[PDB]
Design an enzyme around this catalytic site. Structure first.
Site: not given
Ligand SMILES: NC(=O)c1ccc[n+]([C@@H]2O[C@H](COP(=O)([O-])OP(=O)(O)OC[C@H]3O[C@@H](n4cnc5c(N)ncnc54)[C@H](OP(=O)(O)O)[C@@H]3O)[C@@H](O)[C@H]2O)c1
Ligand SMILES: O=C(O)Cc1nn(Cc2nc3cc(C(F)(F)F)ccc3s2)c(=O)c2cscc12
Length: 315
Positions: A43, A48, A77, A110
């Protein structure tokens, strides 16, 4: 199983590697290790700011003949500053250029909110409000459909859409492609049962982000809730002779969700993969579901009055 079928007939690996906050200097090795260990889904996102370095890893492993392209499921995204119809293709092509790929498996909107176009990812006014753009989700969706038509992406979807926003896409006049996926925050403290039930009932696969509670998110405080240190979840792990991370990754899988834990640590990348040889019980699943507090890791206060802000609705 280990893959879920999407509406285009593609098999999406139920486990993927997340890359948000994986620094460019460390992410290449993280993706190489993940591919070696068996991850077949990464992903990614333009915001990022590491797609070049993920791309390097992918090319290394294709050249090593570890995998061929068709065995990888690569997601990226469309960032908020590119919602304008005329900017979508360029954004997609930039991501593709950075990842050194010819197509994406899945390309998501996104967030439902468009932000003012320009060079800043988070354009702010002088009181720190995010500046929105004159864009709407239906027009952006139309531009996303063109990418499918053009062969740049195999599947399109949405991320952080609430059930009304999903409904708006599905009800679009002249809809050409239904969204394949809605990628949303999902973990024991934000279980999203209603939105998941809705999306699944509509044939949209749900991907759970932040499944470990994003302990490295940049606005975390040391006193905040912590899933990995929740002693109740530790107990469930101990009973299975698994780690709390494994429990947290397994939990969404048994709800028929895709999950995308992030790590840049090789040991953890491997650890996190060891989730296909045990099952959480019914009691375990109910217990984890009962920890729901509607606690959301990913939201920004500076966007709450956006017309498309997704988190005012119940689901
Ligand atoms: N669509 C969106 O808006 C959106 C928003 C948020 C996230 N995402 C996607 O979802 C992915 C995952 O979510 P996230 O990055 O927010 O957080 P997460 O996967 O819930 O947590 C990542 C954190 O957990 C740690 N970690 C991972 N495996 C571990 C384990 N086995 N033991 C202990 N600690 C562990 C990592 O440490 P280390 O890396 O230092 O090992 C990092 O600090 C993102 O990277 C991104 O690709 C998408
Ligand atoms: O967007 C991601 O995947 C994670 C992410 N999350 N966030 C928090 C965010 N919340 C929102 C909320 C909104 C919305 F839709 F609620 F207004 C839009 C963009 C963002 S980005 C960050 O500030 C940020 C900086 S780089 C990557 C991020």
């Amino acid at each position: 199983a280990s893959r879920l079928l999407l509406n285009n007939g593609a098999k999406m690996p139920i486990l993927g590697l997340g890359t948000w906050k994986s620094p460019p200097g460390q992410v290449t090795e993280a993706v190489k290790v993940a591919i070696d260990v068996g991850y077949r889904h990464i992903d990614c996102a333009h915001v990022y700011q590491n797609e070049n370095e993920v791309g390097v890893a992918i090319q290394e492993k294709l050249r090593e003949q570890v995998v061929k392209r068709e065995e990888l499921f690569i997601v990226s995204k469309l960032w908020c500053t590119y919602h304008e119809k005329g900017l979508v293709k360029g954004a997609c092509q930039k991501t593709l250029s950075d990842l050194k790929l010819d197509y994406l498996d899945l390309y998501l909107i996104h967030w439902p909110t468009g932000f003012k176009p320009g060079k800043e990812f988070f354009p702010l006014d002088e009181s720190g409000n995010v500046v929105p753009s004159d864009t709407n989700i239906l027009d952006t969706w139309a531009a996303m459909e063109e990418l499918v038509d053009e062969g740049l992406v195999k599947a399109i979807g949405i991320s952080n859409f609430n059930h009304l926003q999903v409904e708006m896409i599905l009800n679009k006049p002249g809809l050409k492609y239904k969204p394949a996926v809605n990628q949303i925050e999902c973990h024991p403290y934000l279980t999203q049962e209603k939105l998941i039930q809705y999306c699944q009932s509509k044939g949209i696969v749900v991907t759970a982000y932040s499944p470990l509670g994003s302990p490295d998110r940049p606005w975390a405080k040391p006193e905040d809730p912590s899933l990995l240190e929740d002693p109740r979840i530790k107990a469930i792990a101990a009973k299975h002779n698994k780690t709390t991370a494994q429990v947290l990754i397994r939990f969404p899988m048994q709800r028929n969700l895709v999950v995308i834990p992030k790590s840049v640590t090789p040991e953890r990348i491997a650890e996190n993969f060891k989730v296909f040889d045990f099952e959480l019980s019914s009691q375990d699943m109910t217990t984890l579901l009962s920890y729901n507090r509607n606690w959301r890791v990913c939201a920004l206060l500076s966007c709450t009055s956006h017309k498309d802000y997704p988190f005012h609705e119940e689901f």
